[PDB]
Design a protein around this nucleic acid. Structure first.
Lengths: 290, 17, 90, 114, 612
DNA sequence: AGATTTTATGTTTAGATCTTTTATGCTTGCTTTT
DNA sequence: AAAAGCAAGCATAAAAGATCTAAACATAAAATCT
């Protein structure tokens, strides 16, 4: 792979083949055990999902050693959660100190106190959604520096080694391994990190006066191809759809909560009330209400 | 040349000698 | 400040305007750029120069003085060389 | 007197050209105030344009980018939180004479591209 | 789904009796693990001894600086112009703390940049490091380790005796500037009451020290500059004294040698990464079987031959150099290819032949490198390592550069020529006395080499006591040293595969990491990995319709411009091949997960490519 | 009848939140040199 | 005429600035062990 800069300056059979590929990567495992015994850490950099491969390594080989699986594709994990997990469950040392590097110093002391109590550490997606900051990678490199702790990890993003400087890449004593499974990224993309019908479904739950207020904004939008707030207020007080200004502000706050209406303030202080839907579907919606 | 067919052909060249 | 009507300056602009005098000053030829930079930091720690609130040599700055204060410093100064006293007038 | 690896020298002079040559002149120099901001892909494009050897994009090269950042030879004028998303902006923070010394040791004449 | 895949937790303990040598006994008791551990412990201890003997002079100067401050306001401070390879210097600062504690001259805190984001945290880690370091020489909470408590502790302890309070700052470039200047002003405020010494670790140059210290801060600084030796000089010292030593039976090939030095000189100046790469080369060599546990010193090698089973006999037969050894030999080759015990009885001669050839290679190299690298323009390079790579990679006499060396040595005047060959003779004889005589199988190596050196010295006496004799002297140097004892690695004596390591492809794969190349050749031609009978492309831009779904979306992505509307992309993918829209959404989501695209925010239903 | 973890509680500081306001940047819409 | 170049415009977002809150830390009431 030797990219050209001119692109920047001008800017079935598959199941059996995948099973043979997975059986070869399953055959690699004793070599990984010897490589982890010599102090190197394993890094996988294939195309497809490597979740099942590292789960098979935890299941078939590390069935009795201490293991902390870490799901790096989790949107909401924190490095405090992982250090708290090690400090509380592996060592029974209680909660880790609030400074993460103090927690790594504590983990290094307590793991210096116990030889031949190895802690395997499997991190699917070391380039995770909350591990992409430099600080969490510094914590993971300081943890992988420990002789007791061994590390297996997955890599998926193309720009991952931009956050590993030579100090982290020396603490991460990686043995790179091309584990290119062709499996789809189901679990890695299942999480949160990666409409006229909904408008009808929320319009059905509204009361009659809320239907009248939204129909007034729909009629003004189709008539003008966002309405100022004062016209909606005078139209509602003429049609008796509201008691005072504050109930109308509560109804528009409910519409902002259910995203039927976008409120764009003007420089003059008037509030504009756009409906964020194209006018053909809005005309069909007005025809649906008749 | 595979090792098995080479070893077999060399043994044949020895036994034919 | 008098030319650009109180625009924010920089160490590079002020060092260039100083070196244009220093090349013909016949007493300031010997200074290194590092000595002028440490003199600029000495101006900055007295709060005669204040940052607009980027490298330390390129940070923008503001003079904290009226021109009349510098003009009275020009008269109150002891043993001022005549070349600097002539350069101050123009 | 700053001894450097070879590809770190090419990365550093490419970052100097990225911060000194402005965004518009790369199309005329490479298809064949202050220092300017530059994105990391602009740095890799200028590095591949001046390299004339084409090494692959290994882990070690982007590791050289990050460890040049850690030595305050480069800087993070913005971005920081999203180095990997391409929104990061770097800024080279060295003088011209060190670049000419690196181009003497390397043999790459920097002044042709300025 | 899987129990590990939870919507709530992110980490999953599988504790098995953890309180507060991974391999089984079959592997550790195997002989190849024993020989690998022995060779690795020898090589690692020799490299650590070389690093300590190179650091020892600067260590004595720093310890003399601290004791000289102890014999005696500005804080004394010692900049240490260390190299770019920052992780390697923690052993240097640790040796400094060991010397300062052994002399009882000082107590040392070490201030990492990770511990000092703010002035409060810097003062807390500084006082905590000094108090706990004194406690560890012969635990307060970090909230209460004020500088006043440091003064009270120093008065309660060492006022009756003065220990220096050395504060190492190993990563000076990584510090926040305001925190560092405030810390220097704080330590300068306490001088006289508390004796501080502030050694530093400047990876770049002294201009960085003069830049980050302002006029006010440098008013209170009395710094002295020490210089650690350059990283390439340390690499050359390790490569000449360790990887080319006669006493180790394991040798790298010239390709692996050039590859590890290419990683050092062209990427990172870390000695530690070169050592870990050599360790991976040693492990990849020695984990091939007990036949590679024969690769050791000669007596243990004879014991390993008498230990051997049958799979080791098969893997000493399979290796490529045995086939020329067999065809250059009938009943003897039936006894070699079948009888097994005859090969067990014939192994010691081949092992002594290989070890003697590598000893003669090192001695003839110690001859030739002075005589070649003293020359101007240096066709074969200066140091021993370049001639090592050159004589191993290809036959040396057939190279044009050897013809250039013979020509430029033929053009010499008689006095410098005779002085050069006599310098090569004295250097080779000093090497034969110093380094080959203690070694096992070194007496036979000296017995082979020494008459040839006496014949070259007699040719030198013949050219002294008498124009065209210089060509005869060059012929004697060529055919008793370069031709016989400096063969190319393919022309090495048979079963040299036990001793060299030439498998560069798998080790280059497992050391040099290139995720982008694997993602590129997997997203362009899946047939390289999947090996389908239908998915092969005659060229990489074909876009066939039987491809895996990520590849078709990736190619329709690759073949256009920057901003990409999703809709015509979907029409093109639907034209190539409901559930099809869900497959397109899954492919776009995976391709976003790899970082190849990203969704636009200012414009809905669009995507920008992050690659070029 | 007195010392020791043990536990329940209150305080404080760092982090999440609401809100305004300001800005660079992402895209657009012309605009203009080669 | 083709593609690089200057005002325009809304928008994520970034500072910020107060503000409120959740968890870490110091501390007191109290069963527990002697």
């Amino acid at each position: 792979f030797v990219p050209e800069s001119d692109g920047y300056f001008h800017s079935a059979e598959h199941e059996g083949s995948i099973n043979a590929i997975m059986e070869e990567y399953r055959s690699y495992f004793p070599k990984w055990m010897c490589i982890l015994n010599e102090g190197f850490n394993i890094l996988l950099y294939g195309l497809g999902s490597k979740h099942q491969l590292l789960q098979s390594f935890h299941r078939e080989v590390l069935h009795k050693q201490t293991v902390l699986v870490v799901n790096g594709f989790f949107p909401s994990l924190t490095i405090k959660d992982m250090l708290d997990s090690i400090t509380s469950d592996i060592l029974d040392a209680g909660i880790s100190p609030a400074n993460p590097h103090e927690a790594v110093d504590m983990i290094e002391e307590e793991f210096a106190l116990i030889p031949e109590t190895h802690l395997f550490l499997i991190v699917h997606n070391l380039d995770g959604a909350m591990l992409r900051n430099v600080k969490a990678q510094a914590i993971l490199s300081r943890l992988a520096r420990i002789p007791n702790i061994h590390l297996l990890a997955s890599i998926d993003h193309i720009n991952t080694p931009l956050l590993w400087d030579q100090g982290k890449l020396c603490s991460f004593n990686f043995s790179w391994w091309d584990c290119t499974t062709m499996l789809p990224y189901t679990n890695e993309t299942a999480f949160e990190n990666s409409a006229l019908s909904s408008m009808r479904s929320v319009f059905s739950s509204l009361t009659t006066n809320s239907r009248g207020i939204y129909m007034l904004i729909v009629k003004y939008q189709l008539k003008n191809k966002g309405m100022p707030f004062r016209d909606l207020y005078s139209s509602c007080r003429e049609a008796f759809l509201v008691s005072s200004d504050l109930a109308l502000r509560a109804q528009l706050t409910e519409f902002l909560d259910h995203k039927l209406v976008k409120s764009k303030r003007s420089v003059d202080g008037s509030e504009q009330l756009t409906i964020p839907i194209d006018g053909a579907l809005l005309q069909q919606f007005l025809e649906e209400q008749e | 040349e595979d090792y098995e067919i080479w070893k077999a052909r060399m043994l044949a060249k020895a036994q034919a000698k | 400040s008098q030319i650009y009507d109180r625009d924010s300056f920089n160490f590079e602009i002020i060092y260039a305007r100083f070196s244009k005098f220093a090349k013909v000053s016949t007493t300031m030829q010997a200074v290194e750029r590092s000595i002028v930079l440490k003199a600029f930091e000495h101006l900055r720690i007295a709060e005669l120069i204040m940052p607009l609130t980027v490298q330390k040599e390129f940070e923008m700055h503001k003079l904290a003085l009226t021109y009349s204060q510098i003009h009275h410093c020009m008269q109150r100064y002891q043993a001022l060389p005549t070349e600097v006293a002539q350069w101050a007038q123009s | 007197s700053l001894e450097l690896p070879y590809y770190a020298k090419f990365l550093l002079i490419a970052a100097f050209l990225a911060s000194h040559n402005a965004a518009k002149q790369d199309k005329r120099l490479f298809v064949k105030l202050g220092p300017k901001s530059f994105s990391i892909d602009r740095l890799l494009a200028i590095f591949y344009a001046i390299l004339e050897e084409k090494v692959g994009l290994t882990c070690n090269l982007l590791s050289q980018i990050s460890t040049l950042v850690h030595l305050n030879l480069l800087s993070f004028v913005s971005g920081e939180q999203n180095i990997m998303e391409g929104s990061a902006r770097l800024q080279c923070t060295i003088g011209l004479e060190f670049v000419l010394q690196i181009g003497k040791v390397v043999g790459f004449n920097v002044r042709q591209y300025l | 789904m899987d129990p590990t895949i939870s919507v709530s937790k992110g980490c999953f303990v599988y504790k098995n009796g953890a309180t507060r040598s991974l391999l089984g006994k079959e592997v550790v008791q195997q002989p190849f693990y024993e020989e690998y551990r022995k060779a690795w412990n020898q090589i690692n201890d020799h490299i650590a001894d070389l690093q300590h003997r190179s650091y020892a002079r600067t260590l004595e100067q720093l310890v003399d600086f601290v004791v000289g401050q102890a014999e005696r306001e500005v804080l004394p401070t010692a900049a240490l112009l260390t190299g770019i390879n920052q992780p390697d210097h923690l052993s240097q600062f640790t040796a400094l703390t060991q010397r300062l504690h052994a002399q009882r001259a000082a107590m040392v805190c070490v201030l990492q940049s990770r511990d000092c984001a703010t002035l409060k945290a810097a003062v807390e880690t500084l006082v905590f490091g000094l108090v706990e370091d004194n406690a560890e020489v012969e635990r307060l909470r970090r909230s209460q380790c004020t500088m006043k408590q440091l003064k009270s502790w120093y008065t309660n302890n060492f006022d009756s005796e003065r220990r220096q309070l050395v504060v190492i700052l190993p990563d000076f470039e990584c510090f926040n500037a305001s925190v560092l200047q405030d810390l220097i002003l704080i330590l300068s405020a306490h001088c006289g009451s508390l004796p501080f010494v502030l050694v530093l670790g400047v990876a770049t140059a002294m201009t960085a020290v003069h830049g980050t210290l302002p006029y006010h801060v440098s008013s209170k600084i009395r710094l002295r500059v020490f210089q650690t030796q350059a990283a390439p000089t340390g690499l050359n010292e390790v490569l000449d004294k360790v990887l080319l030593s006669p006493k180790y039976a394991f040798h790298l090939s010239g390709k692996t040698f050039k590859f590890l030095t290419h990683i050092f000189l062209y990427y990172d100046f870390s000695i530690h990464g070169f050592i870990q790469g050599f360790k991976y080369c040693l492990m990849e060599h020695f984990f091939g079987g007990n036949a590679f546990a024969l690769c050791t010193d000669y007596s243990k090698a004879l014991g390993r031959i008498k230990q051997l089973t049958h799979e080791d006999m098969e893997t000493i037969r399979r290796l490529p150099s045995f086939r020329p050894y067999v065809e250059q030999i009938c009943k003897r080759i039936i006894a070699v290819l079948t009888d097994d015990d005859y090969l067990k009885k014939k192994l010691p001669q081949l092992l002594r032949d290989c070890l003697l050839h590598f000893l003669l290679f090192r001695c003839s190299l110690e001859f030739l490198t002075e005589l070649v690298g003293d020359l101007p323009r240096c066709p074969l390079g200066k140091l021993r390592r370049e001639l090592y790579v050159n004589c191993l990679n290809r036959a040396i006499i057939s190279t044009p550069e050897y013809k250039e060396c013979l020509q430029m040595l033929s053009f010499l005047s008689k006095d410098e020529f005779v002085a050069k060959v006599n310098r090569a003779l004295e250097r080779t004889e000093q090497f034969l006395v110093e380094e080959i005589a203690p070694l096992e199988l070194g007496e036979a190596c000296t017995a082979v080499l020494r008459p040839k050196l006496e014949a070259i010295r007699l040719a030198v006496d013949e050219v002294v006591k008498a124009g065209r004799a210089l060509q005869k002297t060059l012929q004697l140097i060529e055919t008793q040293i370069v031709q016989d004892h400096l063969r190319a690695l393919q022309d090495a004596p048979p079963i040299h595969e036990l001793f060299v390591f030439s498998d560069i492809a798998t080790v280059r794969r497992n050391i040099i990491g290139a995720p982008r190349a694997a993602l590129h050749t997997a997203l362009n031609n899946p047939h390289f990995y999947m090996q389908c009978k239908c998915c092969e492309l005659q060229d990489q831009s074909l876009l066939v319709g039987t491809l895996p779904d990520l590849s078709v979306v990736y190619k329709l992505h690759l073949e256009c411009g920057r901003m990409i509307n999703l809709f015509d992309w979907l029409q093109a993918f639907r034209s190539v091949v409901p559930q099809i829209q869900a497959r397109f959404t899954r492919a776009v989501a995976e391709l976003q997960f790899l970082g190849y695209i990203k969704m636009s925010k200012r414009k809905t239903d669009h995507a920008t490519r992050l690659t070029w």
